[PDB]
Amino acid sequence: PLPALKLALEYIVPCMNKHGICVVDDFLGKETGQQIGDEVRALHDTGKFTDGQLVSQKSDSSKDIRGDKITWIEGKEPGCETIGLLMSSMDDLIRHCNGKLGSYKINGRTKAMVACYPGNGTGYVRHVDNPNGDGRCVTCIYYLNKDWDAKVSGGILRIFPEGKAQFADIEPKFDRLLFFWSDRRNPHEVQPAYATRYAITVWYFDADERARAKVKYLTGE
């Protein structure tokens, strides 16, 4: 197992700066990944998930755009402590990278979005996570689908990194951690899922961009 310092500086940082996408497989190991899976399944079973929403809701149903159901987790809720461990581990990696990811100064993040595509061909249309400057600079996703066969069950995250001659197809594999720049460099989509698909996302904020975004929100722009 690589320490956070080496994984951040010798792998995540150069991969993010060269490609804008970075995959770390077998991030937490099978035992912890299974416990996270159980916590997510209990959120699902107890009706905590609600339809995923969009930054700007207009005339169309949210379900025309994203077919997932989600809840937000801080990591200290009863029954969510292993999700909290995951979040702490993501945070430790970012802290060890901080200052070397582009020109960003990362001060904070969202709560964790625990999301489920409930099979049935649901997915997420082509989108950019942060197209207009809301502060988000890095998207971090942890996948927890044991026994996923994407050739049958679909659910690939396809990213279209700007300037590259190939797309990036990310299978939502158990215990996989993914980072990518949240801005318009990385439009992406979740292809239809034909089995229940779970993932946990946090977004990290750039300090200056997030402060500007909060100013715009608080002044009504």
């Binding site: 930054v55 809701q57 207009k58 801080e74 970012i94 979005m113 996570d129 197209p131 809301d134 997030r210």
Partner: peptide, 19 residues
Amino acid sequence: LDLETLAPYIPMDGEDFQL
């Protein structure tokens, strides 16, 4: 097209965690 109509919602105030 307003790309914010496709972007995943986050809370804009009250809910940011500080690292």
